[PDB]
């Protein structure tokens, strides 16, 4: 635990001094360091780094945790006279990747975190068979009746993030995550499409007189599409005992669409694109790290 | 725990040094290793080995942790005049075997994991008889009723995963293990057929006006079809206490089917096949390790 | 636990060396070993054995692990002319039978896993009663109604595996478990029976244009049937201390039925049955293992 | 623990060797031991004895653990001639009786296990009120309408075994236990009749044409009903610190009913009942045990 | 724990042998007894004492685990010519009464278990408005309707046991517990009465034509009504450090009622009487036993 | 724990004795003890005293345990000549009140226990709209038909105990608890009332020949009422570190209630008051303690 030995002094009654200290040998050696970075638009990005090593092994092992923030950058553009048009850039998919840059010796990464898991869903089956009868008497005119019915059901529960995370690439040289948006709390998707509302997705109300009150309040969306994203990953690279340095280039991608309201006369309806020429639709940013292995050491660049 | 022994140190009045050093003595060595390799279709396997030699055994004993990514290698065709036609081509099953290669003295196979378990479900089964009568006044002229009924109900529920991971082949010198793809989140199967508008097992919609816009969304799709599969297997392996080297061959196979839309001219239908004849349709690698029991080491080649 | 002692080395100012050694003496000596096998059908079986000392008992005491495999054999078999019938070879039980055989000593077996389980269920009984009544103004004639009814509900609700296990024999020579399919997923078994359809046991559809695609999909089976069986037992053996040798014998048998389809005119109707006159509905392997007690090893022949 | 004491060695730097043994004393100790035994019925039983020596007690006190295995003995019964008719015996009721055969000094049963429980269920009521009216009008004439209605329910929930345990009998000096045979899943008993049908307690079908296929199948019954029972019992028996030897004698019943099938030209009935004149309905075994108090052992004979 | 000391022999190079003892001091003081006696009836009773001194106090504490068994001498009484009546003797009530009798300094009672509990219950009330309203076309002739309704509904959930108990005497001199029938599963109690059927407290069917088989199965009552009663208590007993000895004297009551059938022409009616007549209405016993206190002894008398 | 210390002896090789006494010094120390005492009404209270004595606080503190019995004091009473009416006198309340007597120096009560804890309950409110239409054709004649409808609903959940338990005093020299009945079973309660049946509170039917025969079952009771209460309670004291002695006065109060049932003449109606003539309407005890803080005892007076 956190004791790494003892000291002790014995004192005689003639004032004679000994002194013994005790400290604990291990077999695995571990240092840590930090170190943070902020980019151009405002992203955050902080690496820690757990210097692993192994008396008894022929290796280095170091393992990092990366925790970062990126704003979201949502805007909302209405047209200064038009008053029946309505924008709003949100983020739709959030980007991260990172390189292992080998210097000197070579260096692997053997493990990337979060991985692909396989997800499950609740099934039901049900049937149902009806048999019924019975006999009437109206006034004096007597009636019978003989029914029967069957049925079957099926219901599927699941459960579903606001936002799905999946890597698309893992070498043991780069590693690549996506963090996509799903469905609204409505369940609606970017694929959603009504003949005569159109894409509801982003929708308030279908016949609101204000287009500047007809998008969904802040805390029906996503944090990720009103604030930012706070992703948190994991990295295990190991190389040599006698390498001295290597990089962590990590780079962050935030691809935003747009979201259109239009008054068509009796209604509102809407459209999901991606805006290109449009700048703000894409922000592409990178952070490098080097890692002193030797020294133990984060440093941002 | 990672606590080997310790270190003492007594000093005493005139500067005399003593130094006591305890190590505590194991049952069971615990050595560990780990290397990595990618291949030509950019899929990576690690491997963990963690060298057991237990002093209260005739045999050493070695377990394995094979850890990857398989890229999903899913593709979409569309024509490039034709706009009435298009295909995506996804990843309907992966499959990992593992060989033991013995070269000095033997070695074998023990355990691997996952096995096949046995699964279960909830059963429910209900009746129900009822009994019935009133009278009745219109006017005045009276009437009366008797009815009665039986119903019988049967509900079944489970656990459904979006891939299912069973073992085919299991011997002493190697295993196999193969994660199919079972139904889709809207209950469709490969085997799923309409007569009008044929298998809808991927289809958003029957009526879409874009091709490139009728595919489901990628959130409603497991990450093993829109990303990728994080296989995780286990292995123990056993061997006399003088075996030298041996040997690992793991062998990552990709099958992917073609699910194709059509329009008829009322509407969309889809059919699901193997493309005999796309050399994308499957995609077969190998990764080599090598195993230094003596020297506790994992090597890829 | 890990730790069967400690080794210290003291060195005072002169270079004297003192070494001191503590070891701990336990009621109970673990030994440990394993040997795996594989069979002519491809079957596996791994036997760990865990060999007991109590210093302050007369007696030896094995603890054996048996984990193995066996594949389920399933195969399709279709006439080439005829596409008016399909066979399904599956896997109906899985048997394992165990046997003490003495060579020296005395041995017996004093437990066997798993064993018979009393298995129980939920029950809720429900009774309601009703009373009702009216009055109603039909222009200007008025109407009158009195009402009354009662119901009574049972509903039973259980666990049910796709395979039941239960021993047939358990002396202190011998042990046989049989692993027998159930119901499928369904609910159908090797009793059903219908008029029009027959048993509907493994039919995907009753009009599917294609022999060869009305089977149910591998998903909706289990594993045991489409893959292999992954079994796990654990037995007891007890001896006096001057006991030498002994060996076990396991005995594999797999017991496969044919489900058969045919068209009628207007649909698919099945039967299924115990294929005499086929090879294949029977596979019975044997794998022998030694223990030697005094030199604590477990040896596969 | 397992760790009774330790052993420590110094060594001088002139090879002088000093030796240092440590044990520690307990408080209760405890030796055990384990015989097992098999009938003409091939019924086999296992005792393992724990021998408690409290030298805070002024008694012995040792634990036993009864644990056999009682086969079924279920047969079926087709005449060779008549094919109207079929039995199936099965078993009905195990018994298990333990007596206390005090030798030298007294001894007794002061524990017996399982003990009557009392169990309980889950109790619901409801009480419902309603009231209704409206106004209506077809074409010109206007219309009204007053209800009233109130519901009463009541729900009970419970959890119910295949096989009931208790015991009738238990004084210092022989135990009784009774495990019975409750009702099937389908909820029949040995009470049940149909004027029509009989009592269709073990009956698959009421038209069914082959009689060796008209029982419930096995997944549908019991582990003791189609393959076995796996008792298990514990005593606790006590004498003085000086009782030399002691035995122990066990008594397996298992009494089997027949459950007959018969045509009696339009469907099948049933009806259960015990076959006075078959010695194959009652199985009675003995197994006989002794227990070394001193020398803290187990035999059977 | 159980570890009382340790026992350590040091011997140098030359034969001398040093021994070092050490033993833990305790607060308490733990000395364990028990005794088991039988009675006429064939009721059992276990008494465990825990003689506690606590060497830093001015009082002897025992405590005392009462574990016992009393069999339910149900019994079936028929006419041996009249087949139109039935009876069954069941213990409607187990009474257990302990007493605290000191023989030459005072002893009390502190302790009893168990205790009367206050329980609850869970409560749900619900209430629901309505409202309702259409429009119609028959042929050419219009309609209108409004509709408005409102209900009330109030569930109560409780847990059952099938025996209830509670103390009716606790002082420092004796302690009385009562064990009652309650209610069947069915849900009826010995208060139950119908014009018809009387009361249906024990009764299968109504229209049985066998009396002998028109009694609830075994498995549908409680193991205290068919098979026997197993109690347990508790008592706490104190004193001063200078008592010699004191008794315990218990009673155990068995209060059988009489459940009788009758045939009145068209269906069967019961009657649950106390059958004042009958030897068998009432088993009482006495078990008496004895407690040095000086010695830590539990003797039956 | 209860291991004060350590008694080590070493003995030499020529019959030295070396002693050694190890003691574990506490920070609080803990003397406990316990006195009963029963009275006139045969109402029990055991006192337990836990007495705390911490260095590091500047006085001393006391934590007691009150833990008793009182008995229901449960009647019938029914007129020796009139068989139209009946009499049932039941425990309404039960009141516990403790005093502090300070002797010498002062001594206050700082907790009390139970306290009046703030209750919950689960609410759920649902709002429903509903749309429906439809066409329709008899014979030739063609329908239509268009509904609308809402509703809301409103559920309120909690747990309600058969008495509740309440402080209505709590000062630094006496406290009260009151455990008054809450409601039946059945769910009525002491102001419950009907113009027919005035209050059916212990009212088993309306039209029972009997009327010792018509009082609700005592299973359907609580044991509060059928047989009696076991309160428990606990107080801690403080006092200067040199106060030697103080007492305690508990003072128990059973406030009964009278329910009687009268015929007149079609069927039962009851009423429940609280019989002003009646001695057996009201039952109050006092229980005297005293405490000796220095030498840590309790003693009933």
Do not use: C
């Amino acid at each position: 635990d956190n004791i790494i030995g003892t000291t002790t002094q014995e004192i005689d009654e003639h004032g004679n001094v000994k002194t013994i200290i005790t400290v604990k040998n291990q077999q695995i050696e571990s240092y840590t360091s930090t170190d943070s970075g902020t980019a151009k638009n405002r992203s955050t990005l902080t690496v820690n780094a757990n210097f692993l090593n192994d008396k008894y092994s022929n290796e280095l092992t170091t393992i990092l945790s990366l925790n970062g923030f990126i704003p979201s950058g949502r805007k909302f553009i209405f047209p200064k006279n038009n008053t029946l048009k309505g924008e709003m850039l949100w983020p739709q998919r959030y980007s991260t990747a990172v390189y292992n840059i080998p210097l000197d010796k070579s260096v692997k990464i053997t493990n990337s975190t979060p991985d692909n898991t396989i997800r499950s869903k609740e099934v039901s089956n049900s049937i149902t068979y009806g048999i019924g009868g019975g006999i009437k008497m109206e006034g004096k005119q007597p009636g019978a009746n003989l029914d029967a019915n069957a049925a079957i059901t099926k219901t599927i529960s699941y459960q579903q993030p606001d936002y799905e995370t999946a890597k698309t690439t893992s070498t043991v040289t780069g590693v690549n995550w996506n963090t996509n948006f799903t469905e609204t709390r409505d369940g609606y998707t970017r694929n959603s499409w009504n003949p005569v509302y159109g894409n509801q997705m982003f929708m308030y109300g279908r016949y609101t007189s204000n287009i500047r009150n007809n998008f969904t309040p802040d805390y029906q969306l996503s944090s990720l599409i009103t604030s930012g994203f706070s992703p948190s990953y994991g990295l295990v690279l190991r190389a040599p005992k006698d390498v001295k340095k290597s990089r962590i280039k990590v780079v962050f991608a935030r691809r935003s669409e747009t979201y259109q309201q239009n008054w068509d006369g009796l209604n509102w309806w809407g459209r999901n694109f991606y805006d290109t020429k449009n700048p703000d639709s894409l922000s592409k940013v990178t952070l490098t790290f080097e890692l002193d292995w030797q020294n133990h050491r984060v440093t941002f660049i």
